Structure formats: structure tokens, C-alpha cells
Write an enzyme that holds these catalytic residues in place. Structure first.
Site, PDB file in Angstrom:
ATOM      1  CB  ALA A  49      -9.325  -3.309 -44.223  1.00 21.95           C
ATOM      2  CE  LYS A  55     -13.611   2.471 -44.565  1.00 24.22           C
ATOM      3  NZ  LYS A  55     -12.957   2.611 -43.240  1.00 24.22           N
ATOM      4  CB  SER A  75     -14.043   8.166 -34.795  1.00 19.30           C
ATOM      5  OG  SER A  75     -13.564   7.634 -33.566  1.00 19.30           O
ATOM      6  N   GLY A 103     -16.049   6.076 -39.262  1.00 18.56           N
ATOM      7  CA  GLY A 103     -17.511   5.785 -39.479  1.00 18.56           C
ATOM      8  C   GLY A 103     -17.860   5.071 -40.780  1.00 18.56           C
ATOM      9  CG  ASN A 141     -14.289  -5.003 -39.732  1.00 16.54           C
ATOM     10  OD1 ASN A 141     -13.954  -5.374 -38.695  1.00 16.54           O
ATOM     11  ND2 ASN A 141     -14.264  -3.744 -40.055  1.00 16.54           N
ATOM     12  CB  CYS A 199     -18.232  -4.038 -37.631  1.00 15.04           C
ATOM     13  SG  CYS A 199     -19.187  -5.591 -37.956  1.00 15.04           S
ATOM     14  CB  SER A 208      -7.825   0.620 -34.218  1.00 14.80           C
ATOM     15  OG  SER A 208      -9.078   0.666 -34.670  1.00 14.80           O
ATOM     16  N   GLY A 211      -0.754   2.137 -34.818  1.00 16.04           N
ATOM     17  CA  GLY A 211       0.635   2.561 -34.871  1.00 16.04           C
ATOM     18  C   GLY A 211       1.481   2.024 -33.711  1.00 16.04           C
ATOM     19  N   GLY A 258      -0.746  -4.319 -37.120  1.00 15.21           N
ATOM     20  CA  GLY A 258      -0.656  -3.436 -35.953  1.00 15.21           C
ATOM     21  C   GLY A 258       0.765  -3.018 -35.653  1.00 15.21           C
TER      22      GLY A 258
HETATM   23  C1  LIG Z   1      -8.056   5.678 -41.276  1.00 15.47           C
HETATM   24  C2  LIG Z   1      -8.337   4.240 -40.935  1.00 15.47           C
HETATM   25  C3  LIG Z   1      -9.366   3.489 -41.505  1.00 15.47           C
HETATM   26  C4  LIG Z   1      -9.576   2.191 -41.188  1.00 15.47           C
HETATM   27  N1  LIG Z   1     -10.641   1.438 -41.641  1.00 15.47           N
HETATM   28  C5  LIG Z   1     -10.729   0.129 -41.423  1.00 15.47           C
HETATM   29  C6  LIG Z   1     -11.730  -0.680 -42.135  1.00 15.47           C
HETATM   30  O1  LIG Z   1     -12.463  -0.031 -42.953  1.00 15.47           O
HETATM   31  N2  LIG Z   1     -11.845  -1.931 -41.856  1.00 15.47           N
HETATM   32  C7  LIG Z   1     -10.916  -2.547 -41.054  1.00 15.47           C
HETATM   33  O2  LIG Z   1     -11.007  -3.768 -40.881  1.00 15.47           O
HETATM   34  N3  LIG Z   1      -9.993  -1.868 -40.333  1.00 15.47           N
HETATM   35  C8  LIG Z   1      -9.792  -0.551 -40.579  1.00 15.47           C
HETATM   36  N4  LIG Z   1      -8.814   0.208 -39.963  1.00 15.47           N
HETATM   37  C9  LIG Z   1      -7.896  -0.517 -39.033  1.00 15.47           C
HETATM   38  C10 LIG Z   1      -6.659  -0.988 -39.732  1.00 15.47           C
HETATM   39  O3  LIG Z   1      -6.998  -1.883 -40.775  1.00 15.47           O
HETATM   40  C11 LIG Z   1      -5.714  -1.607 -38.696  1.00 15.47           C
HETATM   41  O4  LIG Z   1      -6.306  -2.803 -38.176  1.00 15.47           O
HETATM   42  C12 LIG Z   1      -5.324  -0.630 -37.535  1.00 15.47           C
HETATM   43  O5  LIG Z   1      -5.071   0.710 -38.051  1.00 15.47           O
HETATM   44  C13 LIG Z   1      -4.057  -1.169 -36.824  1.00 15.47           C
HETATM   45  O6  LIG Z   1      -2.961  -1.271 -37.746  1.00 15.47           O
HETATM   46  P1  LIG Z   1      -1.778  -0.114 -37.756  1.00 15.47           P
HETATM   47  O7  LIG Z   1      -1.111  -0.110 -36.406  1.00 15.47           O
HETATM   48  O8  LIG Z   1      -0.871  -0.470 -38.861  1.00 15.47           O
HETATM   49  O9  LIG Z   1      -2.492   1.241 -38.023  1.00 15.47           O
HETATM   50  C14 LIG Z   1      -8.627   1.532 -40.270  1.00 15.47           C
HETATM   51  C15 LIG Z   1      -7.581   2.232 -39.780  1.00 15.47           C
HETATM   52  C16 LIG Z   1      -7.403   3.546 -40.066  1.00 15.47           C
HETATM   53  C17 LIG Z   1      -6.220   4.226 -39.405  1.00 15.47           C
HETATM   54  C1  LIG Z   2     -22.219   3.367 -37.504  1.00 16.09           C
HETATM   55  C2  LIG Z   2     -21.529   4.533 -36.777  1.00 16.09           C
HETATM   56  C3  LIG Z   2     -22.161   4.819 -35.381  1.00 16.09           C
HETATM   57  C4  LIG Z   2     -21.496   5.805 -37.613  1.00 16.09           C
HETATM   58  O1  LIG Z   2     -20.142   4.127 -36.631  1.00 16.09           O
HETATM   59  C5  LIG Z   2     -19.156   4.795 -36.029  1.00 16.09           C
HETATM   60  O2  LIG Z   2     -19.296   5.938 -35.508  1.00 16.09           O
HETATM   61  N1  LIG Z   2     -17.966   4.131 -36.040  1.00 16.09           N
HETATM   62  C6  LIG Z   2     -16.795   4.646 -35.362  1.00 16.09           C
HETATM   63  C7  LIG Z   2     -15.714   3.570 -35.595  1.00 16.09           C
HETATM   64  C8  LIG Z   2     -16.350   2.625 -36.458  1.00 16.09           C
HETATM   65  C9  LIG Z   2     -15.794   1.531 -37.027  1.00 16.09           C
HETATM   66  C10 LIG Z   2     -16.433   0.637 -37.871  1.00 16.09           C
HETATM   67  C11 LIG Z   2     -15.736  -0.453 -38.501  1.00 16.09           C
HETATM   68  C12 LIG Z   2     -14.806   0.130 -39.644  1.00 16.09           C
HETATM   69  C13 LIG Z   2     -13.533   0.582 -39.052  1.00 16.09           C
HETATM   70  C14 LIG Z   2     -13.164   1.928 -38.958  1.00 16.09           C
HETATM   71  C15 LIG Z   2     -13.943   3.062 -39.404  1.00 16.09           C
HETATM   72  O3  LIG Z   2     -14.432   3.067 -40.553  1.00 16.09           O
HETATM   73  O4  LIG Z   2     -14.123   3.973 -38.584  1.00 16.09           O
HETATM   74  N2  LIG Z   2     -11.936   2.310 -38.308  1.00 16.09           N
HETATM   75  C16 LIG Z   2     -11.061   1.354 -37.835  1.00 16.09           C
HETATM   76  O5  LIG Z   2     -10.068   1.668 -37.184  1.00 16.09           O
HETATM   77  N3  LIG Z   2     -11.453   0.024 -37.908  1.00 16.09           N
HETATM   78  C17 LIG Z   2     -12.660  -0.366 -38.464  1.00 16.09           C
HETATM   79  O6  LIG Z   2     -12.806  -1.562 -38.482  1.00 16.09           O
HETATM   80  C18 LIG Z   2     -17.758   1.021 -38.163  1.00 16.09           C
HETATM   81  C19 LIG Z   2     -18.320   2.157 -37.506  1.00 16.09           C
HETATM   82  C20 LIG Z   2     -17.642   2.961 -36.684  1.00 16.09           C
END
Ligand SMILES: Cc1cc2nc3c(=O)[nH]c(=O)nc-3n(C[C@H](O)[C@H](O)[C@H](O)COP(=O)(O)O)c2cc1C
Ligand SMILES: CC(C)(C)OC(=O)N1CCc2cc(CCc3c(C(=O)O)[nH]c(=O)[nH]c3=O)ccc21
Ligand SMILES: Cc1cc2nc3c(=O)[nH]c(=O)nc-3n(C[C@H](O)[C@H](O)[C@H](O)COP(=O)(O)O)c2cc1C
Ligand SMILES: CC(C)(C)OC(=O)N1CCc2cc(CCc3c(C(=O)O)[nH]c(=O)[nH]c3=O)ccc21
Lengths: 313, 313
Positions: B20, B44, B69, B71, B128, B131, B196, B223, B250
Site C-alpha cells: 500500500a 493507497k 513521510s 502524510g 491500516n 496510522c 515501515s 527496503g 518489507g
Molecule cells: C512512498 C510510500 C508510501 C506508503 N504509503 C503507505 C500507505 O498509504 N499505507 C500503508 O499501509 N503503508 C504505506 N507504505 C508502507 C509500505 O506499504 C510498506 O509497508 C513499507 O514501505 C515496507 O515495505 P518495503 O520494505 O517493501 O518498502 C508506504 C511506503 C512508501 C515507501
Molecule cells: C496527519 C499527519 C500529521 C499529516 O501525518 C503525517 O505527518 N504522517 C507522517 C507519516 C504518516 C503516515 C500515515 C499512515 C500512511 C502511511 C504513510 C504515509 O502516507 O506517509 N507512509 C508509510 O510508510 N506508511 C503509512 O502507513 C499517516 C500520516 C502520516
């Protein structure tokens, strides 16, 4: 250009030292670290009684780092107290003694006894909080109530400046809460970030098997895997604990990695996995490398960049 | 071949999918993942309203992995629901929709609308948990009582099988507690380990600067850095949740890495950083590589080795 530090009412030739548990278990190990070009050394985390530790294999290393479940093998507190009181040559470099009792009472018992030696010889205490308490509860530093209890009791029983070894945290609310606990204790003058990234699992694809015997293969991770985690922790605590020192530990293989630690706020910089793998010759390399980066940038001292990592906008 | 498999009442051509947040934000991205050789895709993580996310730069990659990050930038729930109900070709592969509302109420409002589309079209929910809660509190999955509340409420509102996306844990007592919470919910049929590794810090030595803008450079790591952490979490949950499936995420860059996740217990294998970096062609390489490892070992099915990592003694 110089690598000298003055801190904790000691003088250090350079910021490098072993991480606790590496090249520091036996008299031989401690003499070897003393003979090296490290700026300090720390002894293996001890318990009141000697311990054999966990079954082997219990440490393994790989290109990106290491995994361990050593189980606190050590010669016992009396041995390390003796090394500090009678054997260590303090004219060579300063000595840190790490303690890792399996209960608050065990830690109190050791620090009471350490205290006169610390006062008289200048040995420095590093209390390991990144350790077990009750099985089925989290390690001490992940249980903020236990952590507070440990630091209350150790502050009272020791009554002298000391430092703490912390596990990594992964959540901003935990950084906030952990640093707030530490800031309750004015005797805690240094914070070492970080201990291993806990409970990783390395699997060998050819044999289809985990690589360490204890705990079904689960162990703490060190080395290249953990550098960004370590840097985050050093900076998080550097930012939240302005009246304390932060020592960095995790993922240092080169003077550049050391540079990053120091930019994040590290005073001393500890070396675990890379030292286990390369041996104590690493310290001359790390010094040379760090001085080369300093010379390119025009930095003459550590202070001129420590903690000065830049953020964006 | 073939690596074809059946679960959650759906049939999959192979165990691979995106993680995701990677290549799944826009209709364009979703159609690109649908056209790929992956066995499934996930959207997403969404919120009720559209979000721009955090300031750029917010993602950076390096030889050992990534930091982000983001967001939660996304098109809003109405968009992803529309994609699930009207646009996705379910004859190509199954679809999972990830929901990441910023409160329990927001998640309940989305799941009550998803439910009829899940019944009619067979889209699968990944909730998710990794969060934010209230700011100043840990992420939901790191607060076990909040996690339990989320799951009671979602379970009630949704009423159909769903899965959850978990952050990594690092402490055996935490694995015990978290798995016990998940096991109180019979509708939670799959657990995705892991999101992550939270709040790392990458610093560029040359510029002396962090590399992402939000949060003073702090972001989640993906990664190569996180593979042993991911394996430990997959295995810990696989062991503790015998009536659920575990999905691995992961550090997958190769079929060998996928092989290790499946040995650890993974049913599906998700690809984040490596997919972000290599693009969707990675899925044909991963399948080829996994089938080659299988053939060399004499394995004809995934079931023959899923969860069969060997321990020592
Ligand atoms: C750019 C980016 C966006 C991500 N957004 C989400 C997300 O929206 N929801 C989610 O559950 N995890 C999100 N992740 C986390 C990945 O789904 C995954 O759990 C994490 O990157 C570890 O896997 P990897 O080692 O293959 O990168 C995001 C990761 C990246 C790098
Ligand atoms: C609501 C607010 C304070 C803007 O959120 C954030 O600054 N962040 C930073 C990281 C983050 C992650 C989530 C969950 C979505 C998500 C994200 C992402 O969208 O940043 N990145 C991932 O590696 N895993 C995730 O599960 C939601 C908010 C925020
Ligand atoms: C074999 C081994 C033994 C360790 N023993 C201890 C210990 O006794 N006390 C302690 O605080 N940390 C111990 N550690 C953790 C290290 O001090 C260090 O925090 C961790 O390895 C991260 O640094 P690195 O990435 O340089 O390895 C040990 C690490 C290793 C590899
Ligand atoms: C007491 C008992 C249950 C045998 O302990 C253990 O199995 N372990 C396994 C990991 C561990 C760690 C510690 C703390 C010492 C320590 C060790 C260690 O000695 O294993 N390894 C590290 O990477 N960091 C440390 O801080 C103490 C006990 C145990």
C-alpha cells in the site's frame, strides 16, 4: 584539526569507543581495547553473578550487520569492579563500566559497591535499560513505569553522575515520553542511543533455517540495518535532553557514519558490529576517515559541527 | 510455473502484490498495477476527504532502502470506492482497498460504505493500523486499547472478513499482546506485517542535511534495512495467529527475499520500496526468481514450505 573531547570531567583523545558487549568481556579483551587507539572503552554489561549466557550459536554477522541473543554472558560484577579498581590504566584512556542487572534490586546492589570506586578512580557507569525484567513484560526501557523506578532507585543508591543505554524507539510519542522520564533524573548525564533493534529474524535461504539458536532465532540487530534508526534516536534525545550528553551507537563502519552521528548530536561514538567483525584496528581507520572529512569541510573541532544537522525549510 | 494460489475466497496467479502507498494512488497507477504481472494490488491508504499530504521532498531512496513521510496524500475515499465498484477489472486480479482514517469514526464511516461493494464485487479491506491516533499519542497499533477499540468498531460497522496492516514490533511481550488483541476478532482474516520501521533519520554527509522536509527529516524506513525485522514479525504473527493468514511486507527485492518471507509464514508478499524504484516489471523478475529457487529445491507448491523455517536444536 583535532578529535579531542572534554566531558564528564574526563579527557578523550577521540570520540570512538567499543559498544558494550563487544571486545570487552575478559581481562584480555579489556587490555586489548586499552591498547587500541580508541578514545575510551566500556566493559561488558554485568550481573551480580557470573553467567554462561545462551546456547551457541548466539551471534552471527552478514554484509548488512549482525544478529545476537547472547544472554548476558559475563564474568560477574566483582571481576569488572576489580578491573576498574585495580587493573585499568586510567592514564591510557577513560573506562566506562556497564551494568545490566535482571531486576532493580540487583542493579542497586551493584551500584552501591561501584560508587566508592567511581569516586576514587573515575570509572563511569553506563546503566543498561535495554534489557529484560519480568518475562512477559517488555524490556525495562519499553515500560516507562519500570524505567522510572529503576532510575529513582539507582540515582539514590549511586549518588553520582551516570549514563544510560537506551533501546531504539520508533514513535514520536515514545521519544517524548522517554526523554521526559530521563529529564526527571539530574544524575543521568549521558544517554547512549542505541542498543540493538530488538527481535529481528535472520533466515538463511539455502538451509531454510534461522541462524542463531536461542529464542527460535529471534535476536537483536546491529550494523548497517540500523544506522538511520540510530541517527533518529541520537537526534531525538539530543533535541529533548538539552542538559544531557548523547552518545551515539549503531551502524558505524566508517568516519562518514561517525560524522553523521556527531551531526545528529553524538558526543562519543560507539562501535559494535563493525568492531566485532574488523577488530580493533578499526579505530585508526575511523579516526583517519573522520579527520579527512573534517579537513575537506574546513572543520577543526567536533564542537563546530556536533548537533548541527540541517533541516529543510 | 505455476505459483497460482486461493485464499480469502479469491484466486491469485501468484503471491505478489504492491505494498500500500506504492504505485496505487491514481486511476493511472491502479490500471498500471492491474496490467502488471502481480497476483493482486492494493490501493493507497485513504481518508474520507482528499489530501495533498506533506511538503516535498517527502520520499527518498538509497541503495539500502527508503525513507518517507508522505502524510497520506490520496484522492479520497469516494475515488477509491468508485474505482473498486465501477472501474477495476476483477477478471484480471483481486483488489484490496486500504483505509487509513485519522479517527475511529472516520474509519467506521468509510467501512459502512465499503461493505456493500465488498459484498457485490469482492474487493478486500486492509485496515491500516499503523496510522496516527490523537497527536501526542502513539500510532494506533502501538496503543493496544485503542487498537482493540478500532477493531471492535470496524468489525461491527463492516461485518465482513478484512485484514489489518501492522507496524513492526520489537519486543516479544508486545508480539504476545498484539496477537492476542487480533485474535479477539474473528473477522480479521489476514495480518500484513509490516509497515515501515518508524521514525528513522537519513542524513546526507555532503550537505550535512536531512533528506526529507516533513518532521525535521524523520520518516518511516523501508527496503533492505528492514528485512530481518519484517521476517520476525511475519513469523511471530504466523506462530501466534494460527486461524489467520499473514501477508509479508518489507525488504523484498528478489525471489529469494520472497522465499524467506514465505518460509517465515507469508501467504501473499507485498513489494514497496523495490517496486517504487524498479517499476512494475519487477513482478515478472520476482516470479521467475521464486520459481527458480523452488525448482532447485524440489518444491512444487508454496504450501510445501510456507511457515516451515527451521529452528536450531
Ligand atoms: C512512498 C510510500 C508510501 C506508503 N504509503 C503507505 C500507505 O498509504 N499505507 C500503508 O499501509 N503503508 C504505506 N507504505 C508502507 C509500505 O506499504 C510498506 O509497508 C513499507 O514501505 C515496507 O515495505 P518495503 O520494505 O517493501 O518498502 C508506504 C511506503 C512508501 C515507501
Ligand atoms: C496527519 C499527519 C500529521 C499529516 O501525518 C503525517 O505527518 N504522517 C507522517 C507519516 C504518516 C503516515 C500515515 C499512515 C500512511 C502511511 C504513510 C504515509 O502516507 O506517509 N507512509 C508509510 O510508510 N506508511 C503509512 O502507513 C499517516 C500520516 C502520516
Ligand atoms: C555480540 C553483542 C553483544 C552485545 N552486548 C551488549 C551488552 O552487554 N550491553 C549493551 O548495552 N549492549 C550490548 N550490545 C549492543 C551493542 O552495544 C550495540 O548497542 C548494538 O550492537 C548496535 O551497534 P552496532 O550497530 O555498532 O552493532 C551487544 C551487541 C553485540 C553484537
Ligand atoms: C535472561 C535471559 C532470558 C537468558 O536473557 C536472554 O535470553 N537475553 C537475550 C537478549 C538479552 C539481552 C540482555 C541485555 C544484554 C544485551 C545483549 C546480550 O547479552 O544478549 N545483547 C545486546 O545486543 N544488547 C544487550 O543489551 C540480557 C538478556 C538477554
Amino acid at each position: 584539526m583535532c578529535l579531542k573531547l572534554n566531558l564528564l570531567d574526563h579527557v578523550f583523545a577521540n570520540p570512538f569507543m567499543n559498544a558494550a558487549g563487544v571486545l570487552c568481556s575478559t581481562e584480555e579483551d579489556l587490555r586489548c581495547m586499552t591498547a587500541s587507539s580508541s578514545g575510551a572503552l566500556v566493559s561488558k554489561s554485568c550481573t551480580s553473578a557470573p553467567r554462561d549466557g545462551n546456547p551457541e550459536p548466539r551471534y552471527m554477522a552478514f554484509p548488512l550487520g549482525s544478529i545476537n541473543s547472547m544472554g548476558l554472558p559475563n564474568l560477574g560484577f566483582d571481576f569488572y569492579l576489580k578491573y576498574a579498581s585495580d587493573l585499568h590504566d586510567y592514564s591510557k584512556k577513560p573506562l566506562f563500566l556497564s551494568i545490566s542487572g535482571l531486576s532493580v534490586e540487583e542493579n542497586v546492589a551493584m551500584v552501591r559497591r561501584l560508587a566508592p570506586v567511581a569516586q576514587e578512580k573515575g570509572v563511569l557507569l553506563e546503566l543498561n535499560l535495554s534489557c529484560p525484567n519480568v518475562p512477559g513484560k517488555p524490556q525495562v526501557a519499553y515500560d516507562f513505569e519500570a524505567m522510572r523506578t529503576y532510575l529513582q532507585q539507582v540515582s539514590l543508591a549511586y549518588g553520582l553522575p551516570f549514563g544510560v543505554k537506551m533501546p531504539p524507539y520508533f514513535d514520536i510519542a515514545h521519544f517524548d515520553t522517554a526523554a521526559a522520564v530521563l529529564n526527571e533524573f539530574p544524575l543521568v548525564k549521558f544517554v547512549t542511543c542505541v542498543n540493538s533493534v530488538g527481535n529481528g529474524l535472520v533466515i538463511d535461504a539455502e538451509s531454510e533455517s534461522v541462524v542463531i539458536k536461542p529464542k527460535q532465532g529471534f535476536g537483536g540487530l546491529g550494523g548497517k540495518y540500523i544506522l538511520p534508526t540510530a541517527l533518529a534516536n541520537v537526534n531525538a534525545f539530543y533535541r529533548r535532553c538539552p542538559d544531557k550528553l548523547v552518545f551515539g551507537c549503531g551502524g558505524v563502519y566508517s568516519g562518514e557514519d561517525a560524522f553523521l552521528h556527531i551531526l545528529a548530536g553524538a558526543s562519543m561514538v560507539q562501535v559494535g558490529t563493525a568492531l566485532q567483525e574488523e577488530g580493533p584496528g578499526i579505530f585508526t581507520r575511523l579516526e583517519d576517515e573522520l579527520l579527512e572529512i573534517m579537513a575537506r569541510k574546513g572543520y577543526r573541532t567536533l564542537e563546530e559541527f556536533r548537533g548541527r544537522v540541517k533541516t529543510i525549510e
